[model samples]
Target: SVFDSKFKGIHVYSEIGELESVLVHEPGREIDYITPARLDELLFSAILESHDARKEHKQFVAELKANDINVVELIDLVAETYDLASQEAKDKLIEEFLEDSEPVLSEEHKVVVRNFLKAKKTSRELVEIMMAGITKYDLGIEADHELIVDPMPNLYFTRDPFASVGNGVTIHYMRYKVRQRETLFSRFVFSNHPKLINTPWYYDPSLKLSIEGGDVFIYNNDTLVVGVSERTDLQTVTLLAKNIVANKECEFKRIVAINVPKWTNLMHLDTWLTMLDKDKFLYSPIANDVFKFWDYDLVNGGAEPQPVENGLPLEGLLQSIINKKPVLIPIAGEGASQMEIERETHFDGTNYLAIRPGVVIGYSRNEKTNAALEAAGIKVLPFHGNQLSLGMGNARCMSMPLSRKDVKW
Candidate 1:
């Protein structure tokens, strides 16, 4: 196959593939606004102490940089996009954001906020205003809520806005209205950045049906595991699957859609399942208990989602897909009691970011889980995430892999 080496800026064939580049967002001032009353609305489990959260995040990224991984920040990408975009183009980007406001911007505040954004001269200022949001107090306007525009505190959970599949991406339509704007930052970077301008979009945010990256997983070059969970709609999964199978440039030949229970605490597939190695998984004991499968294949006109025995024998089906019996390790370690498992699980003990095969970065708090991983011959690089966990995401939840080297099974 002939190829322009510079064109394909994104490539991730499997979770355990060697990491080359990744994207992340450090905790910003937006985190400070997550009030107790708005915890669930903002998708945060508890209030975060931003200072410590930012500190912990620095240490985490330090490891990535030390390992020679190109760690890109969302803000840096957005800022560069602003610099490259034409004046009219930049205005349009900001317009689309204001137009897609969560609370629905009132007519009175539209011009006010527009002028406020316009006044910001530098790329950094504009990007900050867009994410951190402006306040009614800043405009000398009285209101019930202090914010003129709602802050996107959830941006730190970078994995949920856009999913990077094999050599492509799916900029998502967030399940919650408050978090919808998060996709715009990623869209701008991928669509406007010179390096990523040619990347394919299997499912962009333009589609109305809600879907999130947290539910998508790439197991191999030809197979993908997607979750039909609270954040990702069933209809969107089929839409994404059809796009992949139909695209000649894409290598995906089959998609396995697994229906997981719809619950906020159990929001994403990553919350209950994650890759530990090429043929091993760290998962909740009941991870497959609620799966309802829909199989899609290129040879079968691919677009149709065919159910499998009403979801019987999920693990058996997965074994067939990967062509091997996978090693499934229980989350929270082998010795964890029900209470221990339940407690650690709630804080994302299963969400691990694999830097390479058999290696992962995780929260230090999940001691039992980490211990079991070490005992099982997996390397665990632990970090402090005390304040970051208040947002209910660990290392994996906080990152988006931009590129991974292909690995043979």
Candidate 2:
């Protein structure tokens, strides 16, 4: 509490303003998952390759800054909440690992950790990240870090943390138990910040709701689309709907839930579809256009909201969701048929930061994906990074938009 005065009014929202400031946690442990001994653990567990993840993330943020978007660099070493060590020195070792990707906790590492955490001054966001780690591990019923990592590493697709549906916000309740911390983190930040004008949609306790920003899409101020994967349940969606109805920030018209296949590949909605323009989207024909989920929008209702209508098929639902008939550019890049889909998803074809409608920044590695975007008339910018895909996130996973100009219908 000694330094509490240094950070004040951390939460603030100007709902109508275009992205003025954004918060980001650069990749730390995302890189710790690369060793052959750790490879299985990395892939199956929560950690990811930090070096490439952080590099690719920087690329996306650069694009945002280039467009005059204000950037808020979170001070490092604030989230020491997930210390894998009990002794003070051991904790320092982990901190060193996070800050510079140093090897496993060492005697030297412990020295670094003490100095870092001992330092009184740090950023509020960093504190929040640390708080997030603690809330996920220490506070949860079973603070099993490994269990949390197994299902949630995919949450790195930054879009999942929070979603802006037109003028309102839809808080994605994280489906993965390990990654649930991300949802709590966003809720705490948005709710506590005086600057943010958060729209209601996630207050009910009965719904036991979970959502991810990656699954929610902002079509216009009034309409929004969401994907209900294994991670997102119907109960959570109900919670989201109730919150939207009570708020006056934006009209809640339709909530299109696209239920993706139950597989590691289709982890979240962003993995398959993302908006490239008002009339265009980057979609995997096999995964996105093929499979889907639909739930009706309701006003005042029952234990679960009443189904207004039968669910629409993915393609059919999209046509109804976006007023204009949008184009779904296929990522079938020229190659042996088998490798094409793998190539697109592996390179994070669906992961790209949209600076504005019709303009986006994605990894240069996804040549086929970018080609598909350009084919749809979207301005695609290339980015460079070493072994970027190894981290399982792309340019989009790296940046979080603080605000955006409302889409004019």
TM-score of every candidate: 0.94, 0.70
lDDT of each: 0.82, 0.53
Off by over 4 Å in 1: 1-8, 302-314
lDDT of 1 by residue, 36-154 (tens): 99898888888998899999999999988887788888888789877987787788887988898867889878888888888888878789878887788767778787887888998
Question: Distance from true position, residue 215, model 1, in Å?
Answer: 0.5
| Regions of candidate 2 where Cα sits further than 4 Å from its true position | 1-21, 33-49, 74-157, 197-207, 248-250, 288-290, 299-304, 307-315, 333-336, 385-388
Q: Which candidate number would show the highest lDDT if scored against the true structure? A: 1
lDDT of candidate 2 over 65-91, digit per residue (tens): 787766544322122322221356334
- Write down the RMSD of candidate 1 (Cα, Å): 3.0
Model 2 / residue 346 / CA error / Å: 3.4
lDDT of candidate 1? 0.82
